[PDB]
């Protein structure tokens, strides 16, 4: 039923043919307008039928520059004015006639309009528009100090029919405007379907009603559910008496502005309660058991980026590159840190990398392909920059099947992959790193999985006996599975307990 509206004000394109066409597509067959109803400059030979089944407009109703004879809005009950035109007008009807033509607006077929929750009315400069001066507009408008402006309209209009009692939208006997406001008992806070104190509207009717119930409301102060007005849509989880907890309520329904629905529109996604366009800044789409839904990401939603090397512009992360990683969590492909990259090259004018910019990678948790470090900024003796890196897939390899390759990095002492736990596939190579220690104790049968036989290549790093002599060993609180460096934060897994990545005695 429901469908959205426009915000274009009084701007159009050159084609009045297009202006019609484009108008039709939007307000297709539509009961509720979520937005505004902007009928501007519309074609003179319009056949405005689709407009019939329109009951409500959450915003305002703008009718300007048009040429057609009558505005056919028969099911239109409520205009909310929750946003409003110019500033103070829920209905703005201005300048609907042409000079060279007799095509001009003569009637507003608003037979059904019952009330306007917020905003005034501007009915001016409509040379042939008729009967508007007869209507009681303070009967419709809910705001005691909204601007009701009606003038410079028709000149020679026929009198109302005798059945309309001098207040009518058109000459017809069915074109009579029916009164809404009787003023009211003190109990009913201006919300009643009759004078009496017992004749109060239900506490969920946005404006008036025709009875003291859910489904007698002219409009719903919160959500409409299949006819009834309710403060909420039926919740997703109902408390079960059998299991003493909550369970997936099959009578659940999602919000959509003010309508409880069975399933969100073809484009829209669920967010805890409402049907929304795009997930908020802390969620990503999750399809599970025939339902799409916004799930809170926690740390960060996976900002997955392009990697480097094979199938990418860069064979190395360089100074004109590093910026294109900010906030990045997952990485598609690889990451190569080559000699040039770091120091740049003055032949091809590509500057040297600012070593602090590397921190960018602290946000990273996963890398699809391989990681390849063949150079590192001397004053940093470890890759604590990838401390948060948890998984290396190895889905694309480097040299001869290498999913991880560290090589020829002199000043590097520890590794610093505190969070690394899985290298899914590929070979590993950590050789020729002349001051690297702590890696000897690491159990690569736990990090890597699948075969173990001929997948390791660790060699010509600082020999273990030196590392041990200088005290460089796995913190006592580590398990025999080893460590990424010194201290309690760097363990593979802990002997006792672990409080926020750091292994503890209690």
């Amino acid at each position, epitope marked *: 039923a429901v469908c959205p509206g426009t915000l274009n004000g009084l701007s159009v394109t050159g084609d009045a043919e297009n202006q019609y066409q484009t108008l039709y597509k939007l307000y297709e067959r539509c009961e509720v307008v979520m937005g505004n109803l902007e009928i501007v400059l519309t074609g003179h030979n319009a056949d405005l039928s689709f407009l019939q089944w329109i009951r409500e407009v959450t915003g305002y109703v703008l009718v300007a520059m048009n040429e057609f004879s009558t505005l056919p809005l028969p099911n239109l009950r409520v205009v909310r004015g929750t946003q409003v035109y110019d500033g103070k007008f829920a209905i703005f009807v201005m300048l609907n006639y042409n000079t060279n033509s007799s095509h001009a607006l003569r009637q507003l077929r608003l037979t059904q309009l019952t009330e306007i929750l917020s905003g005034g009315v501007y009915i001016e400069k409509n040379d042939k528009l008729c009967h508007m001066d007869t209507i009681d507009w303070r009967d419709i408008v809910r705001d005691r100090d909204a601007e009701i402006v009606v003038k410079d309209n028709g000149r020679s209009c026929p009198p109302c029919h005798e059945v309309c009692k001098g207040r009518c939208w058109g000459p017809g006997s069915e074109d009579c405007q029916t009164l809404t406001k009787t003023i009211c008992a003190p109990q009913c806070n201006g919300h009643c379907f009759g004078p009496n104190p017992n004749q109060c509207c239900h506490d969920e009717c946005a404006g008036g009603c025709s009875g003291p119930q859910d489904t007698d409301c002219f409009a719903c102060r919160h959500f409409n559910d299949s006819g009834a007005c309710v403060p909420r849509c039926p919740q997703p989880l109902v408390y079960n008496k059998l299991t003493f907890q909550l369970e997936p309520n099959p009578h659940t329904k999602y919000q959509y502005g003010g309508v409880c629905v069975a399933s969100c529109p073809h484009n829209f996604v669920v967010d805890q309660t409402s049907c929304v366009r795009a997930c908020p800044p802390d969620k990503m789409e999750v399809d599970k058991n025939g339902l799409k839904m916004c799930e809170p990401c926690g740390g960060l939603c996976p900002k997955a980026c392009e990697g480097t090397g094979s199938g990418s512009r860069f064979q190395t992360v360089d100074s004109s590159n590093i910026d294109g990683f900010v906030n990045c969590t997952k990485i598609l492909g690889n990451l190569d840190f080559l000699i040039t990259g770091l120091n740049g090259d003055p032949w091809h004018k590509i500057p040297a990398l600012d070593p602090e910019k590397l921190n960018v990678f602290r946000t990273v948790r996963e890398i699809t392909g391989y990681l390849n470090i*063949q150079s590192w900024p001397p004053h940093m003796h470890n890759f604590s920059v990838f401390s948060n890196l948890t998984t290396i897939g190895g889905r694309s390899l480097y*040299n*001869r*099947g*290498f999913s991880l*390759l560290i*090589m*020829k990095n002199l000043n590097v002492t520890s590794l610093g992959f505190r969070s690394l736990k899985e290298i899914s596939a590929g*070979r590993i*190579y950590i*050789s*020729a790193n002349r001051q690297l220690c702590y890696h*000897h104790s690491l159990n690569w049968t736990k990090v890597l999985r699948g075969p173990t036989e*001929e997948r390791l*290549d*660790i*060699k*010509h790093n600082r*020999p*273990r*006996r030196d590392c*041990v*002599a200088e005290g460089k060993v796995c913190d006592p609180l580590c398990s025999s599975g080893g460590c990424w460096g010194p201290g309690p934060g760097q363990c593979l897994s802990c002997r006792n307990y672990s409080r926020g990545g750091v292994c503890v005695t209690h």
Partner: antibody
Amino acid sequence: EVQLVESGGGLVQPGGSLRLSCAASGFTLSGDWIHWVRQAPGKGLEWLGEISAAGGYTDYADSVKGRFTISADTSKNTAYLQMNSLRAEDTAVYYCARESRVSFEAAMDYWGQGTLVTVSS
Amino acid sequence: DIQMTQSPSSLSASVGDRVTITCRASQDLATDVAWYQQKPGKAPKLLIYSASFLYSGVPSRFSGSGSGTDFTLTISSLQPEDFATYYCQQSEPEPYTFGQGTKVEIKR
């Protein structure tokens, strides 16, 4: 099954230059470390150089560091010793030999048969 | 630069005898010493690694011992085919130095 084969050794003129071949067989160099050692026909062994096949790293014995250059070619599965500026004291049997798998050690577990380089005028 | 000193240079022994070779290193090598056997004109076969471990396909009579500065090879039951020159090797880091070697020959 796993074996090495060398070639190309022989007489050379002092200050001349030479390239030894060490053709691998029964395994993949890639990742494995190939070392070269030599031995004077009387005396014992001396280590010369080494080379990972993956990243192509190379170290050298100071007794040789610069005059010699150890390389390989991965697709071909063979290592190479380039022996420039040869002195008479270079006369020795040269073996290539790959490194052991079990342990961070450089124990060499498979060895070529040897190839002889005599360097005299 | 590391020294290996291997004692004695040559040695004779009867078949069945026990034989003990010694390498002494210039600097604490903890455990990174490899032992090899080299027969006349053949390439040297590896016998022991990490001072004390046997390699796959060496008879159990060959055994190695020691830590740090003093390392030892022992052929318990000497045989005729055990004739060789025997070489200890430091393998801790490069450049790998070897011993002078111990020439073994049998008594008959």
